[PDB]
Design a protein around this ligand. Structure first.
Ligand code: ZTN
Ligand code: ZTN
Ligand code: SF4
Ligand code: SF4
Ligand code: SF4
Ligand code: SF4
Lengths: 445, 419
């Protein structure tokens, strides 16, 4: 008979021995965040459909407007009517409500405060003194169970812990000066170094963002996106599940940082800022790196967003996982073949970046992320075709052969219906939600 | 669960029985806010705002290694963790409930929000609606509501009887750090105006504001069953922040569809009445809306809008007749706040709205137990048949947002059950 799926068993079966799985060489340096395609001057500008050169997201706005006027849900993709086209973009735009300027990357600004002191919640609770009382628990085992339980309350579908590898922390962040109001933010962005110093608490000076040398650990969360909506990539409903998950990330960071602070430790939120989420997720055992470049998880494949929190709270690091992704990506190449911009390489992994947007010195598939971003104004969205076509995104991949779990190799061989179809709270799917049930034994060993 | 809900659909019409004495209720009359109930002694005999006296009890409990009143924790560390989780859960909530309208997270226009500003070149909030069909709009907005974190969603015509006559708020330029000391009353009125607007004198809801969308946000059963101890406080708190995110997300969706939207959380009006009229559940002896999926172990929020929508039908699955003979909450209530008598139209005190048929409870007695116990009690929710130690909770089953995969299939939704 069919053995019922057991996600905890799967992770136990594929657990590796301790050690960062990412292979590096001597040319590895920390990466300046301004080099990402979203921010770098070589890639930031893209033409719109009239040939006007603009910040990429403004060119994409132009395409969204054109699609709604023409009753389309995506490039060359007719909607049922203009109202359906309108509804998809209204859902997408609303999803971003709790996210600043597409990713919350400015450290210690807006929602990403590095101290809780000025928050309305901290002020309301100040008489209890939870953020000023020394920790009552220093045992990493108990702290790991407490913080992972809190992480699930805070909206994580996956959570893992790693020691902080500074190689993945940006050498300089993109931010804004502290006196700049929101309406000027996009015009006043600056770079600011992230440094590690012997100080008691995270602190920002005029010159530096300072992380304490005591900042030992990173907690990584996976925030699951909706399968049906992502499968509409590159059209608007894939944009909407992306957007809503960014606001879920923001809530997660603030909730968890406050819990950690109220336990007597400090906590640094980040969302898409501070450092490279995929590398942290791999080191924390959420999944493995992939050809497309994302972290592929056993539960969701790559169809999951990542955020992370940095802390001095003593914790037990999780073990990395190896469930064969590297070997499958070596022969699969579906994302590379379906990529509308040919951004994803079909070749082997190397240590040599394809362009300024890649960090050299770590073994990975090297993709051209300027080509990727170029498709976003063209399509009026955030694409996601690679996530959508990846076999690991299917809910169907795990089988048990009577002895152990394995991947089913057979897997690698419209929007109106989405609006009219299955949905549940936060876009989670009750057919798979048991996969993320958690007891103490899977939170800490 | 879609089976049961249409099996128990009533015909259209508000099921709340009223008389000609009914008047709209001033929000300041709630036990949280009224001067006769706001101050309570702490365990040392010092009289303070009730939540400050409760704070003193939380500190005393942590020091004494307790998770609740006379409830020893495994150690001081466990006691601390429960209160840290509780305090963190409130991160996206202002002053216990987000009640001040058109302040902080509860803005009545999206125009100044960072998200609206970023999206302004697209013009979604300025473009006339492309859809005016209430059937399609009901399907769209309910789908959005599930994306926004509602476990239940319903629609009713707006009954102004349940809108507060006057809100508790603060002056618009008062900074957060002075908010608790500068609360004021302000009338909520309905006028022929295009958009929701606030003047120096009034909160003005348009006469075109036809509908209310009510969301149920499920609490965690294991944690609520620790009532009156700290983990019940934590699931309460996290759900208040889920309420706030729901309101903001859904208001933005409605605005980007070409309509206006008023968020509320615990402000603006009486959630239980709206929830009953929108078919989420039935009123109960304890006073909560009891739902088939969660019983009373579910939080409520609501959004008011001129968006054309199809009202849901009220539901009758026998709660009234069950509460008539049960009385379990009334017998377990640590403060004897809940009546064992029959329903009447006459409030027991200033905290009740007279003129509607309900079980009349003494809500000052309830609030009095909160500083004593250092929490938000919830024993009534925990013991209710419809709802069905702390170390075992921390070591036990949990899942995303505290939802339970053993029951999460009950809130799956297709178009057939949305409209
Ligand atoms: O604008 C964005 C859209 C989707 C994902 C991102 F990280 C973005 F910055
Ligand atoms: O349910 C609540 C719990 C604590 C404080 C409040 F104001 C509430 F409304
Ligand atoms: S589509 Fe294939 S090659 Fe690309 S990331 Fe997925 S498994 Fe790897
Ligand atoms: S998001 Fe689209 S354009 Fe970018 S790599 Fe994936 S498939 Fe290619
Ligand atoms: S919350 Fe507690 S004190 Fe209040 S009515 Fe319920 S059981 Fe009674
Ligand atoms: S405990 Fe019994 S009387 Fe009280 S609300 Fe629940 S069913 Fe009704």
């Amino acid at each position: 008979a069919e053995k019922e799926k057991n996600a905890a068993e799967i992770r136990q079966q594929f657990a590796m021995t301790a050690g960062s799985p990412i292979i590096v060489n001597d040319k590895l340096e920390r990466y300046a965040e301004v080099r990402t395609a979203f921010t770098h001057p070589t890639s930031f500008f893209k033409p719109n459909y009239k040939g006007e050169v603009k910040p990429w997201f403004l060119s994409a706005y132009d395409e969204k407007v054109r699609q709604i006027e023409n009753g389309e849900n995506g490039p060359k993709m007719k909607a049922k009517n203009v109202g359906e086209a309108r509804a998809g973009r209204a859902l997408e735009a609303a999803g971003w409500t709790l996210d600043i300027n597409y990713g919350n990357i400015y450290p210690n600004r807006f929602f990403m405060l590095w101290s809780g002191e000025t928050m309305t919640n901290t002020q309301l609770w100040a008489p209890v003194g939870l953020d000023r009382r020394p920790p009552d628990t220093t045992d990493p085992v108990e702290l790991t169970n407490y913080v992972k339980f809190a992480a699930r309350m805070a909206g994580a579908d996956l959570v893992g812990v790693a020691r902080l590898n500074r190689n993945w922390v940006y050498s300089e962040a993109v931010t804004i000066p502290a006196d700049v109001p929101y309406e000027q933010s996009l015009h006043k962005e600056i770079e600011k170094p992230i440094v590690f110093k012997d100080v008691p608490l995270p602190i920002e000076t005029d010159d530096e963002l300072i992380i304490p040398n005591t900042c030992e650990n990173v907690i990584v969360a996976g925030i699951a996106m909706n399968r049906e909506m992502m499968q509409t990539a590159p059209n608007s409903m894939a944009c909407a599940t992306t957007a809503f998950c960014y606001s879920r990330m923001c809530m997660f960071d603030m909730w968890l940082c406050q819990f950690i602070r109220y336990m007597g430790y400090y906590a640094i939120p980040s969302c898409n800022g501070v450092g490279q989420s995929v590398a942290f997720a791999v080191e924390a055992g959420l999944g493995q790196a992939s050809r497309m470049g994302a972290c592929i998880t056993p539960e969701f494949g790559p169809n999951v967003r990542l955020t992370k929190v940095f802390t001095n709270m003593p914790l037990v690091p999780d073990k990395p996982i190896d469930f064969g992704v590297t070997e499958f990506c070596e022969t699969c190449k579906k994302c590379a073949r379906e990529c509308p911009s040919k951004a994803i390489t079909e070749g082997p992994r190397t240590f040599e970046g394809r362009s300024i947007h890649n960090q050299s010195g770590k073994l990975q598939w090297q993709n051209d992320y300027n080509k990727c971003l170029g498709y976003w104004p063209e399509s009026g969205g955030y694409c996601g075709v690679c996530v959508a076509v990846c076999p690991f995104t299917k809910g169907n991949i795990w089988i048990h052969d009577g002895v152990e779990w394995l991947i089913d190799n057979t897997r690698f061989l419209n929007i109106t219906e989405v609006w009219d179809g299955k949905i549940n709270t936060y876009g989670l799917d009750a057919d798979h939600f048991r996969d993320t049930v958690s007891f103490r034994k899977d939170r800490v060993k």
